[PDB]
Amino acid sequence: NNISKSAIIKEGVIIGENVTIEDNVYIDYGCIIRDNVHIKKGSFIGARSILGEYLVDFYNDRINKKHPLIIGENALIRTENVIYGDTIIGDNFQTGHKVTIRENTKIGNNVKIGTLSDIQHHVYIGNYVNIHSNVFVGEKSIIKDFVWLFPHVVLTNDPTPPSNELLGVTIELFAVIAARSVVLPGIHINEDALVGAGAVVTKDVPKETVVVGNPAREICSIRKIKNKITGEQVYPWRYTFKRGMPWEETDYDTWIKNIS
Amino acid sequence: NNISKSAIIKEGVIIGENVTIEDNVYIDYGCIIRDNVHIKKGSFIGARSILGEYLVDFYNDRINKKHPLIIGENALIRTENVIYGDTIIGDNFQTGHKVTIRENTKIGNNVKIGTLSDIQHHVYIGNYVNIHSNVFVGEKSIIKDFVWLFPHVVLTNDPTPPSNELLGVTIELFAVIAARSVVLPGIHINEDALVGAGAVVTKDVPKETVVVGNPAREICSIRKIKNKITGEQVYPWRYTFKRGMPWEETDYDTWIKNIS
Amino acid sequence: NNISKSAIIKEGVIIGENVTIEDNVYIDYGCIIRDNVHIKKGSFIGARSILGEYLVDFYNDRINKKHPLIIGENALIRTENVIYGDTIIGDNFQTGHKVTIRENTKIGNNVKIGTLSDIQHHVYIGNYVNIHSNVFVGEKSIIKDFVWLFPHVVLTNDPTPPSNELLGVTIELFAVIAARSVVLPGIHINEDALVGAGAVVTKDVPKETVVVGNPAREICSIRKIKNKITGEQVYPWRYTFKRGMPWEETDYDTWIKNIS
Ligand SMILES: CC(C)(COP(=O)(O)OP(=O)(O)OC[C@H]1O[C@@H](n2cnc3c(N)ncnc32)[C@H](O)[C@@H]1OP(=O)(O)O)[C@@H](O)C(=O)NCCC(=O)NCCS
Ligand SMILES: CC(C)(COP(=O)(O)OP(=O)(O)OC[C@H]1O[C@@H](n2cnc3c(N)ncnc32)[C@H](O)[C@@H]1OP(=O)(O)O)[C@@H](O)C(=O)NCCC(=O)NCCS
Ligand SMILES: CC(C)(COP(=O)(O)OP(=O)(O)OC[C@H]1O[C@@H](n2cnc3c(N)ncnc32)[C@H](O)[C@@H]1OP(=O)(O)O)[C@@H](O)C(=O)NCCC(=O)NCCS
Ligand SMILES: Cc1cn([C@H]2C[C@H](O)[C@@H](COP(=O)(O)OP(=O)(O)O[C@H]3O[C@H](C)[C@@H](O)[C@H](N)[C@H]3O)O2)c(=O)[nH]c1=O
Ligand SMILES: Cc1cn([C@H]2C[C@H](O)[C@@H](COP(=O)(O)OP(=O)(O)O[C@H]3O[C@H](C)[C@@H](O)[C@H](N)[C@H]3O)O2)c(=O)[nH]c1=O
Ligand SMILES: Cc1cn([C@H]2C[C@H](O)[C@@H](COP(=O)(O)OP(=O)(O)O[C@H]3O[C@H](C)[C@@H](O)[C@H](N)[C@H]3O)O2)c(=O)[nH]c1=O
């Protein structure tokens, strides 16, 4: 292995082979770090998490195959997270308690995944993505940058279950899916769109449109929305909300003029 | 610290500083008790729970700040519960497995929180409150006495997400929210009201009224409800159900005549 | 006790009395095996699971009563599962992470229960049953063979909560309940029926019928359904899908001609 003299490893931690722990990594009590795991500098790994979780092939003969897991810098991984092999997570990742992340998945930077959330295999999550408590992300889902998935949201993939050909849901830039909503297979949720709480999304959602209900129905453009406390127009949200965003220290316009 | 000679502490338990464990406390295998935690007499702490969980300030320099957690007497805390600092829990608390409770929260007495439930920060829960499996309780929610939140219920707080001004849901005395229901931000659910299973509650619910659907719509007064097996009028429920209630040994009327 | 010389027991495992571990059982790091547990040959028990979990009677005087838990052969139990006493699980069981299973429950063979799923007490689950992520199975539910319960599905049991007489939901052979659906108490979901995603099922569902919505309404026979990618008729699904089924190596007809 390769563990930095500056890394902090608490009691109970169990470590396998081909593991690399960078400078200033703090690995809390009882974590289990299986083989082929690489933790980047300054990350914090929560108590009892288990990284490099066994893929199915393992169970064939109980011999662990190489399926490397990498986790970027300054991660803030909370307790008991379970993270599979063949997956990559970028920098400044942050999680809640008891989150599960499967294999063959890609998570960008400045992403957050709340308590109990379950990310399946072969999922793609971009940067500055916010996934709250107990969200279900099924295999083949595509979540672009700045997307927000609120508590208990569920993204499915089998259109006539159980079947052999799955279709991933794709959520475009800045879209917001409110709490307890479920999106049916292969659906496309367009940029800056808003899915109202509890909805059952059965058809694509066009850009900047608000849908609500079961089945979800279009009700208006997001620009119609006024802040309930201040009465100001809320969306596009990038212009009215910037906590934890790359433009926090400035304004979206100036920031995107630079980025582009 | 301060640990009672009569407390039982199993193997694997890890204890920090400024921890007080009262008489007849049984702390099961592998619990992690971080700093500033006070457990009151006769409580039972489930295997691997982690009490005094780190607040965000901790992560700044990995130096633990004082954020005292107190847990009342005769608690029956099941396995792997995670409980944050700056929170207070009363007597006779009971939980299911893998429950999470955040900071700056207050839980009364004779409260129950089922398996997977997630209580956010700055939440208020009164006495004799029943929260079942996997309920989501967002910051700023107010749950008064004798409220029942059934499995997978979700209480939200951001009315036009993502935004800066949140509005907590307030649930009044004896109200019942059936399974898989979601309540929108700032909504007021009145006393003895009944929210039918799976509903999407978008407007306040008046006292003793039954709402159902997405969006939830009023259908009748709870007094219209007849027990499906016995045909008797069910609500107000205090008069027809008393298991685990303070009037179990008597009748509601006699009991409330005394209490008041 | 009785532990086979061929069993593999990792570090941290804690074992009680009256425990029997058969040949080729692999018990991963830190599992807690309480009293009266019997694990059948070749099973794999995930890290930190806790088997023989305490029943309520335990808490009376913190003296563990005999409530035997049995787990059939070649189980693939993933991490942190919690399994109660007085329950029986058949062969080839498979689970996801952090699943909870209560007492007085019966699970058949070739059953799968995904991540976060919560099976309550006194539940009956047959063979070749598929329960996905975070499904809630309340006491008194009856799930027959070949049933599929997709993510976040919830089966309830108290028809006018809170009340004293519960009514279990019964799901017949091959039925499919899509994601985020909730079924009300005592409902009967008939064979080969299909409950569409997110539905609120309030009335029995007849055989081979598709219901959708809140409240769920019948829309057509499942035979009307065409595969979204291939355009072929999907149901009955036994004829179009056989991954992990007893007819995988043949065809349903030939297979059932033999079985019967
Ligand atoms: C989309 C949203 C912001 C509502 O916009 P809105 O302007 O408040 O809609 P209004 O209440 O002013 O009026 C909307 C009408 O559609 C209905 N409606 C509003 N939201 C609905 C929903 N989620 N589902 C179904 N119907 C809804 C209202 O009841 C009203 O119906 P009506 O014709 O009977 O009067 C809201 O539904 C929502 O989902 N907010 C997000 C809550 C959340 O999950 N936050 C994240 C968790 S913290
Ligand atoms: C409120 C409740 C008790 C129903 O009252 P009810 O008297 O049985 O209503 P009924 O079925 O007799 O008749 C109600 C009508 O409204 C509909 N309806 C009933 N419950 C509904 C619901 N939750 N959502 C939407 N529609 C509903 C019925 O289908 C029927 O509609 P119809 O006009 O097509 O006939 C029930 O909906 C409920 O939520 N029970 C709680 C289940 C639960 O979660 N227990 C806790 C978990 S164990
Ligand atoms: C039942 C199901 C397969 C849909 O059948 P369908 O043939 O695609 O229905 P269609 O979309 O072709 O047309 C159906 C009509 O009913 C509506 N509808 C379809 N599914 C609906 C649902 N779950 N709830 C409410 N309405 C629905 C459609 O929007 C359309 O309504 P319309 O009159 O406004 O056009 C689908 O609803 C479903 O639940 N699939 C399972 C998704 C899933 O959970 N997989 C498991 C998780 S991976
Ligand atoms: C900071 C923190 C977070 N978490 C987990 C809890 C939750 O599942 C997830 C998000 O917690 P959060 O960071 O407190 O929530 P966030 O600030 O992103 O969202 C909040 O603000 C947005 C704008 C509102 O719409 C939302 N409804 C609010 O919760 O992370 C924890 O468990 N502990 C923590 O200390
Ligand atoms: C007693 C007990 C409880 N729990 C957890 C499981 C669940 O998430 C929560 C409530 O379990 P419960 O006490 O068995 O359920 P309760 O008796 O409160 O509710 C029951 O009765 C009411 C009246 C019905 O409406 C309800 N649908 C029934 O479940 O506590 C456990 O995990 N293990 C236990 O041994
Ligand atoms: C194989 C495997 C499974 N699981 C858990 C994750 C999930 O909660 C449960 C099912 O995982 P799965 O076996 O990958 O899902 P399954 O193949 O049964 O279902 C899939 O195919 C069916 C036909 C689709 O309708 C469905 N939407 C797909 O997920 O088991 C894990 O956690 N890790 C694993 O390696």
Keywords summarizing the entry:
260 residues, mainly beta, UDP N-Acetylglucosamine Acyltransferase, domain 1, Ubiquitin Ligase Nedd4, Chain: W, ten-stranded parallel β-sheet, 2 helices, 32 strands, 30% strand, binds coenzyme A, binds the ligand Cc1cn([C@H]2C[C@H](O)[C@@H](COP(=O)(O)OP(=O)(O)O[C@H]3O[C@H](C)[C@@H](O)[C@H](N)[C@H]3O)O2)c(=O)[nH]c1=O
Give an overview of the whole structure.
3 copies of one chain form a homotrimer. Chain A is mostly beta strands and 260 residues long. Chain A folds into 2 domains: 1-221, Hexapeptide repeat proteins (UDP N-Acetylglucosamine Acyltransferase, domain 1); 222-260, Ubiquitin Ligase Nedd4, Chain: W, CATH 6.20.70. The first copy, chain A, is built from 2 helices and 32 strands. Chain A has a 10-stranded parallel beta sheet, with no helix packed on it. Chains in contact: A-B, A-C, B-C. The interface between B and C is large, with 47 and 37 residues. Bound molecules: coenzyme A (COA) (3 copies) and ligand T3Q (3 copies). One copy of the ligand Cc1cn([C@H]2C[C@H](O)[C@@H](COP(=O)(O)OP(=O)(O)O[C@H]3O[C@H](C)[C@@H](O)[C@H](N)[C@H]3O)O2)c(=O)[nH]c1=O sits between chains C (78, 96-97, 114-115, 130, 132-133) and A (56, 138-139, 157-158, 161-162). One ligand T3Q sits between chains A (78, 96-97, 114-115, 130, 132-133) and B (56, 138-139, 157-158, 161-162). Chains A, B, C: Acetyl-CoA binds at residues 157-159, 179, 197, 203, 214. Chains A, B, C: It comes from Thermoanaerobacterium thermosaccharolyticum. Chains A, B, C: CoA binds at residues 157-159, 179, 197, 202-203, 214, 228. Chains A, B, C: This is QdtC.
